[PDB]
PDB file of C-alpha atoms in Angstrom:
ATOM      1  CA  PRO Q   1      46.259  46.238  43.460  1.00 16.75           C
ATOM      2  CA  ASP Q   2      46.815  49.526  45.462  1.00 14.16           C
ATOM      3  CA  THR Q   3      42.841  49.414  45.408  1.00 14.56           C
ATOM      4  CA  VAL Q   4      42.746  45.903  46.731  1.00 12.90           C
ATOM      5  CA  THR Q   5      42.056  46.452  50.566  1.00 13.55           C
ATOM      6  CA  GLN Q   6      38.676  44.286  51.032  1.00 14.63           C
ATOM      7  CA  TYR Q   7      39.023  40.489  52.248  1.00 16.71           C
ATOM      8  CA  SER Q   8      36.264  39.881  49.448  1.00 14.81           C
ATOM      9  CA  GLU Q   9      38.230  41.377  46.672  1.00 14.31           C
ATOM     10  CA  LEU Q  10      40.938  38.077  46.730  1.00 13.55           C
ATOM     11  CA  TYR Q  11      39.912  34.066  46.339  1.00 14.58           C
ATOM     12  CA  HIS Q  12      41.764  32.738  49.568  1.00 16.81           C
ATOM     13  CA  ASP Q  13      43.800  29.558  48.039  1.00 18.65           C
ATOM     14  CA  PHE Q  14      46.017  30.163  50.494  1.00 19.50           C
ATOM     15  CA  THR Q  15      45.071  31.276  53.938  1.00 19.76           C
ATOM     16  CA  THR Q  16      42.416  28.743  54.584  1.00 18.06           C
ATOM     17  CA  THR Q  17      41.750  25.313  54.959  1.00 17.09           C
ATOM     18  CA  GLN Q  18      45.876  24.708  53.913  1.00 19.47           C
ATOM     19  CA  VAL Q  19      47.498  20.873  53.500  1.00 22.24           C
ATOM     20  CA  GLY Q  20      48.061  19.987  56.985  1.00 21.45           C
ATOM     21  CA  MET Q  21      45.324  22.177  59.081  1.00 23.32           C
ATOM     22  CA  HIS Q  22      42.729  18.990  59.580  1.00 25.90           C
ATOM     23  CA  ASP Q  23      45.585  16.551  61.242  1.00 27.15           C
ATOM     24  CA  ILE Q  24      46.514  19.544  63.935  1.00 27.40           C
ATOM     25  CA  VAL Q  25      42.511  19.447  65.058  1.00 30.19           C
ATOM     26  CA  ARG Q  26      43.001  14.956  65.027  1.00 31.71           C
ATOM     27  CA  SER Q  27      45.814  15.998  67.068  1.00 27.62           C
ATOM     28  CA  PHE Q  28      43.504  17.997  69.849  1.00 28.56           C
ATOM     29  CA  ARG Q  29      41.318  15.022  69.712  1.00 27.84           C
ATOM     30  CA  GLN Q  30      43.474  12.845  70.281  1.00 26.11           C
ATOM     31  CA  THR Q  31      44.193  14.970  73.910  1.00 24.98           C
ATOM     32  CA  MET Q  32      41.324  14.990  74.983  1.00 25.15           C
ATOM     33  CA  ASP Q  33      40.583  11.334  74.643  1.00 23.52           C
ATOM     34  CA  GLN Q  34      43.382  11.290  77.213  1.00 24.47           C
ATOM     35  CA  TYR Q  35      40.606  12.523  79.645  1.00 21.05           C
ATOM     36  CA  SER Q  36      38.054  10.188  77.869  1.00 20.13           C
ATOM     37  CA  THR Q  37      38.668   6.502  79.189  1.00 21.25           C
ATOM     38  CA  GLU Q  38      36.172   6.859  82.201  1.00 21.06           C
ATOM     39  CA  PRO Q  39      33.023   5.952  81.662  1.00 18.17           C
ATOM     40  CA  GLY Q  40      29.916   8.479  81.532  1.00 17.92           C
ATOM     41  CA  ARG Q  41      33.136  11.689  81.187  1.00 15.11           C
ATOM     42  CA  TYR Q  42      33.365  12.186  77.735  1.00 13.90           C
ATOM     43  CA  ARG Q  43      34.977  14.970  76.460  1.00  9.26           C
ATOM     44  CA  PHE Q  44      33.129  16.838  73.616  1.00  8.60           C
ATOM     45  CA  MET Q  45      34.872  19.066  70.573  1.00  7.55           C
ATOM     46  CA  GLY Q  46      32.848  21.150  68.401  1.00  3.25           C
ATOM     47  CA  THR Q  47      34.681  22.678  65.410  1.00  6.36           C
ATOM     48  CA  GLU Q  48      33.404  26.104  64.482  1.00  7.43           C
ATOM     49  CA  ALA Q  49      34.000  27.171  60.065  1.00  6.51           C
ATOM     50  CA  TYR Q  50      31.244  29.623  59.318  1.00  7.39           C
ATOM     51  CA  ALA Q  51      30.838  31.455  55.526  1.00  4.12           C
ATOM     52  CA  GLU Q  52      32.149  28.091  54.228  1.00  2.00           C
ATOM     53  CA  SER Q  53      31.005  25.619  51.547  1.00  2.00           C
ATOM     54  CA  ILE Q  54      28.997  22.333  52.897  1.00  2.00           C
ATOM     55  CA  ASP Q  55      31.317  19.854  51.104  1.00  2.00           C
ATOM     56  CA  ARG Q  56      34.171  21.228  52.852  1.00  2.00           C
ATOM     57  CA  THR Q  57      32.331  21.883  56.764  1.00  2.00           C
ATOM     58  CA  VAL Q  58      30.935  18.297  56.424  1.00  2.00           C
ATOM     59  CA  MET Q  59      35.192  17.644  56.467  1.00  2.00           C
ATOM     60  CA  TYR Q  60      35.209  18.220  60.293  1.00  2.00           C
ATOM     61  CA  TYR Q  61      33.089  15.108  60.783  1.00  2.00           C
ATOM     62  CA  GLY Q  62      36.401  12.555  59.551  1.00  2.00           C
ATOM     63  CA  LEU Q  63      36.621   9.428  58.639  1.00  2.00           C
ATOM     64  CA  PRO Q  64      35.830   6.272  59.842  1.00  2.00           C
ATOM     65  CA  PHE Q  65      38.567   5.079  60.464  1.00  2.00           C
ATOM     66  CA  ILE Q  66      39.949   8.163  62.176  1.00  2.00           C
ATOM     67  CA  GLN Q  67      38.155  10.745  64.397  1.00  2.00           C
ATOM     68  CA  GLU Q  68      37.834  14.085  64.192  1.00  2.00           C
ATOM     69  CA  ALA Q  69      34.963  16.897  65.527  1.00  2.00           C
ATOM     70  CA  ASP Q  70      32.103  15.390  67.285  1.00  2.00           C
ATOM     71  CA  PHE Q  71      30.080  17.366  65.297  1.00  2.00           C
ATOM     72  CA  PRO Q  72      30.854  20.752  63.547  1.00  2.00           C
ATOM     73  CA  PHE Q  73      28.534  23.518  64.023  1.00  2.00           C
ATOM     74  CA  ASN Q  74      25.851  24.269  62.079  1.00  2.00           C
ATOM     75  CA  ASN Q  75      24.833  27.598  61.724  1.00  2.00           C
ATOM     76  CA  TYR Q  76      23.221  27.635  57.966  1.00  2.00           C
ATOM     77  CA  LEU Q  77      19.370  28.533  59.138  1.00  2.00           C
ATOM     78  CA  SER Q  78      21.402  31.787  61.255  1.00  2.00           C
ATOM     79  CA  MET Q  79      22.179  32.569  57.808  1.00  2.00           C
ATOM     80  CA  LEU Q  80      18.095  33.359  56.503  1.00  2.00           C
ATOM     81  CA  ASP Q  81      17.474  36.866  56.430  1.00  2.00           C
ATOM     82  CA  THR Q  82      13.964  35.628  55.068  1.00  2.00           C
ATOM     83  CA  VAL Q  83      12.386  32.353  55.235  1.00  2.00           C
ATOM     84  CA  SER Q  84      10.309  30.519  53.152  1.00  2.00           C
ATOM     85  CA  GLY Q  85       9.294  26.437  52.446  1.00  2.00           C
ATOM     86  CA  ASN Q  86      11.779  25.721  49.521  1.00  2.00           C
ATOM     87  CA  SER Q  87      14.350  27.834  51.628  1.00  2.00           C
ATOM     88  CA  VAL Q  88      14.029  25.733  54.873  1.00  2.00           C
ATOM     89  CA  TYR Q  89      13.905  22.289  52.364  1.00  2.00           C
ATOM     90  CA  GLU Q  90      16.963  23.166  51.247  1.00  2.00           C
ATOM     91  CA  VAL Q  91      19.567  23.880  54.072  1.00  2.00           C
ATOM     92  CA  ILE Q  92      17.997  20.677  55.931  1.00  2.00           C
ATOM     93  CA  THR Q  93      18.154  18.421  52.546  1.00  2.00           C
ATOM     94  CA  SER Q  94      21.632  19.877  52.542  1.00  2.00           C
ATOM     95  CA  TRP Q  95      23.030  19.405  55.931  1.00  2.00           C
ATOM     96  CA  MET Q  96      21.372  15.478  55.507  1.00  2.00           C
ATOM     97  CA  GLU Q  97      22.812  14.120  52.496  1.00  2.00           C
ATOM     98  CA  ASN Q  98      26.225  16.157  52.341  1.00  2.00           C
ATOM     99  CA  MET Q  99      27.156  14.689  56.492  1.00  2.00           C
ATOM    100  CA  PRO Q 100      28.039  11.049  56.091  1.00  2.00           C
TER     101      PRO Q 100
ATOM    102  CA  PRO R   1      49.704  32.949  28.640  1.00  2.00           C
ATOM    103  CA  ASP R   2      49.948  32.383  24.893  1.00  2.00           C
ATOM    104  CA  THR R   3      53.922  30.823  25.260  1.00  2.00           C
ATOM    105  CA  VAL R   4      53.140  28.773  28.712  1.00  2.00           C
ATOM    106  CA  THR R   5      53.671  25.544  27.448  1.00  2.00           C
ATOM    107  CA  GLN R   6      56.319  23.411  28.950  1.00  2.00           C
ATOM    108  CA  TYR R   7      55.453  22.624  32.981  1.00  2.00           C
ATOM    109  CA  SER R   8      58.579  24.526  34.610  1.00  2.00           C
ATOM    110  CA  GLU R   9      56.670  27.545  33.639  1.00  2.00           C
ATOM    111  CA  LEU R  10      53.683  27.375  36.244  1.00  2.00           C
ATOM    112  CA  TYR R  11      53.521  27.061  40.375  1.00  2.00           C
ATOM    113  CA  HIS R  12      51.707  23.850  40.723  1.00  2.00           C
ATOM    114  CA  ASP R  13      49.718  24.626  43.742  1.00  2.00           C
ATOM    115  CA  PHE R  14      46.664  23.401  42.351  1.00  2.00           C
ATOM    116  CA  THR R  15      46.848  20.692  40.628  1.00  2.00           C
ATOM    117  CA  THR R  16      49.734  18.760  43.743  1.00  2.00           C
ATOM    118  CA  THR R  17      48.803  17.620  46.803  1.00  2.00           C
ATOM    119  CA  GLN R  18      45.220  19.441  47.444  1.00  2.00           C
ATOM    120  CA  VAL R  19      43.528  19.087  50.562  1.00  2.00           C
ATOM    121  CA  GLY R  20      42.508  15.185  50.822  1.00  2.00           C
ATOM    122  CA  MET R  21      44.633  13.205  49.219  1.00  2.00           C
ATOM    123  CA  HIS R  22      46.826  11.844  52.138  1.00  2.00           C
ATOM    124  CA  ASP R  23      43.166  10.319  53.430  1.00  2.00           C
ATOM    125  CA  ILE R  24      43.078   8.626  50.410  1.00  2.00           C
ATOM    126  CA  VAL R  25      46.512   7.092  50.820  1.00  2.00           C
ATOM    127  CA  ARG R  26      45.158   6.429  54.815  1.00  2.00           C
ATOM    128  CA  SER R  27      42.360   4.604  53.377  1.00  2.00           C
ATOM    129  CA  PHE R  28      44.780   2.561  50.856  1.00  2.00           C
ATOM    130  CA  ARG R  29      46.274   0.996  54.097  1.00  2.00           C
ATOM    131  CA  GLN R  30      42.569   0.182  55.749  1.00  2.00           C
ATOM    132  CA  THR R  31      41.741  -1.641  52.595  1.00  2.00           C
ATOM    133  CA  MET R  32      45.693  -3.454  53.416  1.00  2.00           C
ATOM    134  CA  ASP R  33      45.000  -3.721  56.665  1.00  2.00           C
ATOM    135  CA  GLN R  34      42.307  -6.562  57.045  1.00  2.00           C
ATOM    136  CA  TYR R  35      45.217  -8.943  54.470  1.00  2.00           C
ATOM    137  CA  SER R  36      48.325  -8.284  57.249  1.00  2.00           C
ATOM    138  CA  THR R  37      46.131  -9.613  60.324  1.00  2.00           C
ATOM    139  CA  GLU R  38      47.993 -13.451  59.930  1.00  2.00           C
ATOM    140  CA  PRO R  39      51.179 -12.904  61.718  1.00  2.00           C
ATOM    141  CA  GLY R  40      53.645 -12.891  59.632  1.00  2.00           C
ATOM    142  CA  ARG R  41      52.136 -12.295  56.916  1.00  2.00           C
ATOM    143  CA  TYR R  42      52.042  -8.323  57.379  1.00  2.00           C
ATOM    144  CA  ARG R  43      51.413  -6.151  53.510  1.00  2.00           C
ATOM    145  CA  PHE R  44      53.765  -3.557  52.760  1.00  2.00           C
ATOM    146  CA  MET R  45      52.790   0.241  51.468  1.00  2.00           C
ATOM    147  CA  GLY R  46      55.104   2.349  49.737  1.00  2.00           C
ATOM    148  CA  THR R  47      54.540   5.618  48.298  1.00  2.00           C
ATOM    149  CA  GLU R  48      56.878   7.244  45.363  1.00  2.00           C
ATOM    150  CA  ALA R  49      56.806  11.387  45.095  1.00  2.00           C
ATOM    151  CA  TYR R  50      59.973  12.014  43.225  1.00  2.00           C
TER     152      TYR R  50
END
């Protein structure tokens, strides 16, 4: 453990995505709802969470009875260092099948 | 680790109260809300966590 200094040498189970984090993002959406009541002046909320699994990114969409981000920002096409027909297909189908 | 057999010898960070558990309890409350709309017939939900 004297040599564990790089971030990729640990599993970050205690410092990222803890119980209660999504409720803080939902209270940000509630604060912005008081400025969205006038028609044509809806206020947008997007979230950025990168280097993440697709099943954790999709949780920022919320639930059908609980509002959260309007969308989380999708950067999975930006992470393609080389392009191919199979690699573009799996990025498009991962987002469309996993999002609610 | 061959002798770790009692439940009190581990910290249960991965098997109790995970991310997403409270949302399952909130969806139980939403199911019971469809039977609570008539006045005087509210449906109670209590949770036990000791």
